[PDB]
């Protein structure tokens, strides 16, 4: 019995440290701690797969239980990135097949997934694979799906949301129906499936007692009544298709929705069918009227009925009027997204504009807001001040102002941005997309100066000259990822700002004063710094994408993508 050290107890304690940022530190106190973290780390996420070799990952964390890889830049979600850009997942699955023999959950995000590489996954990991998330991926088919549902007999969560694949049949769903029991969450929310049987979906609901969430394609809701009755423990449902014919005015008034259902969004839902929600609106906590066919007035009447709503996603049709309703009925609101609707034939009505009015109304009512993303048709410095004044635990704030409107009340937002950034000091992600006059170099530097916590920024049309970008660059202590498009800065100005930024590890840019030389970008050449130049897919000016990588320049570039390498 000698005095007991930490070293006598650390292997045990380490497994109680859950925070990814504390494991980070802990791995760095010494060689022993590093090894212990290495052999106990359960989940890792790579924000950019090209950042390291799959070898390096398996060597560092041999006993991962969960992995998550992201590929294509965020811009890809906007048909800005070429389809062939890369993000291929195969090297990663041959590595999983061979060295991550403990893996029970895989999440691919914005990646290329082939039938082969998922057949490989399925066989390699089989019964052990509890969860698989094909999140916004492409390049596979139903054969792939069929392969993972037959070999991975114990899948608890299976997801394809917004993924695109080739649909050759429906046997994958049916194979789930006939043999799966463990299913807890099933998700093909933004997907064109035309060959799967609602019957199978119902027979799955019957057999999976722990089925909590399911999101789905353009199924006719009526075809799902069998389903809903059977899905007792269902808490979330999004998707489906409400199709009204005139021949039935009460087509949908006899809907059994599962009793616990509290997170939902019915697609195409009009004002006529909207009422089927009233019977239990008190209970609804998440609402997805993103793909709903109801107008500004109809919004107010529904929102007004859901006092316990904490998440709401809708189009700008919600209107200022809608935002005002939200303002005093839903005080517990934590996340709000207002995507932009049909900006073609008028708005979607004459109240389908959000403005200073709505924002400042919202800022006063829903003070518990943590996430706010909004496409606005008009702002005022005042509104941003009220934001930064009332809602303190805002972590994620994104604002984009539409070019629809010709004159914007008061434009240079320098002083509004500032009070906002100063009031919400919990802010980690921040996006600000304007029109040209939107922000002066003075304001831009205000952003650098007052965003100590922000790791990610998406910047719109900020600044007036490179003076602004430089002023900006002397700030942003913790900026890691920077995305800017539609800016007036020059190559050497960018390259310079990159050098000044301490924390930056990922840079994407579209639109900048170029030079045939190309050589001005070069003045940011560091070791481990990869820079790439891009076109565009689904007039599109050059993209710059640069990131740190321990791996070197990728092998798998398309023809459309150029890798800069000192003097050519």
């Amino acid at each position: 019995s000698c005095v007991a050290t930490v070293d006598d107890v650390i292997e045990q304690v380490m497994t109680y440290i859950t925070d990814p940022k504390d494991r980070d530190s802990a791995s760095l106190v010494c060689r022993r701690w590093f090894k212990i973290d290495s052999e106990t780390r359960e989940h890792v996420t790579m924000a950019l797969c090209y950042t390291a070799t799959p070898d390096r990952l398996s060597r560092r964390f041999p006993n991962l239980r969960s992995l998550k890889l992201k590929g294509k830049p965020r811009a890809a979600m906007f048909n800005l990135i070429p389809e062939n850009w890369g993000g291929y997942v195969t090297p990663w699955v041959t590595e999983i097949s061979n060295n991550l023999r403990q893996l029970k959950s895989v999440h691919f995000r914005r990646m290329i997934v082939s039938d082969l590489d998922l057949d490989r996954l399925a066989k390699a990991r089989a019964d052990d694979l509890e969860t698989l998330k094909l999140d916004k991926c492409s390049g596979f088919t139903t054969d792939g799906l069929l392969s993972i549902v037959t070999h991975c007999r114990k899948i608890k969560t299976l997801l394809m949301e917004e993924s695109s694949f080739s649909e050759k049949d429906g046997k994958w769903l049916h194979e789930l129906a006939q043999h799966n029991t463990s299913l807890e969450v099933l998700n093909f929310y933004m997907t064109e499936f035309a060959k799967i049987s609602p019957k199978d979906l119902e027979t799955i609901a019957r057999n999976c007692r722990s089925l909590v969430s399911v999101k789905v394609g353009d199924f006719e809701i009526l075809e799902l009544v069998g389903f809903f009755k059977a899905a007792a423990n269902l808490e979330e449902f999004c998707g489906g298709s409400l199709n009204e014919d005139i021949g039935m005015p009460e087509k949908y008034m006899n809907l059994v929705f599962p009793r616990k259902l509290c997170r939902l969004g019915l697609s195409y839902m009009g004002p006529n069918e909207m009422p089927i929600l009233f019977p239990f609106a008190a209970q609804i906590r998440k609402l997805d009227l993103l793909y709903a066919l109801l107008e500004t007035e109809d919004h107010c009447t529904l929102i007004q009925k859901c006092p316990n709503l904490e998440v709401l996603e809708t189009r700008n049709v919600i209107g200022d009027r809608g935002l005002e309703v939200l303002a005093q009925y839903c005080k517990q609101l934590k996340r709000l997204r207002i995507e932009r609707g049909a900006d073609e034939q008028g708005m979607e009505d004459e109240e389908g504009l959000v403005s200073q009015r709505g924002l400042i109304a919202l800022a006063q009512g829903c003070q518990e807001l943590e996430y706010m993303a909004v496409y606005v048709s008009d702002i005022t410095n005042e509104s941003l001040e009220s934001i930064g004044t009332y809602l303190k635990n805002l972590c994620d704030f994104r604002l984009v102002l539409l070019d629809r409107e010709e004159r914007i009340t008061d434009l240079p937002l320098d002083n509004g941005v500032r009070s906002l950034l100063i009031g919400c000091k919990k802010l980690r992600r921040f996006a600000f997309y304007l029109r040209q006059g939107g922000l002066t170099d003075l304001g831009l530097s205000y952003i650098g100066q007052y965003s100590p916590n922000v790791r990610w920024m998406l910047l719109g049309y900020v600044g007036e000259s490179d003076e602004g970008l430089m002023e900006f660059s002397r700030g942003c202590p913790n900026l890691q990822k920077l995305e800017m498009r539609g800016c007036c800065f020059s190559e050497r100005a960018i390259a310079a700002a990159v050098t000044k930024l301490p924390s930056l590890r990922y840079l994407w840019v579209q639109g900048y004063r170029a030079s045939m030389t190309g050589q001005d970008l070069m003045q940011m050449a560091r070791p481990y710094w990869n820079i790439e130049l891009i076109p565009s897919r689904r007039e599109h000016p050059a993209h710059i994408l640069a990131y740190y990588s321990l791996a070197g320049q990728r092998t798998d570039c398309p023809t459309t993508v150029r890798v800069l390498k000192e003097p050519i």
Binding site: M77, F78, M190, R340, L402
Partner: peptide, 18 residues
């Protein structure tokens, strides 16, 4: 002339809408 790029999930929907 940089146009506001539409988030793809909504682009798909706005067409189905019409």
């Amino acid at each position: 002339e940089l146009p506001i790029a539409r988030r793809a999930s909504l682009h798909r929907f706005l067409e189905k809408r019409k």
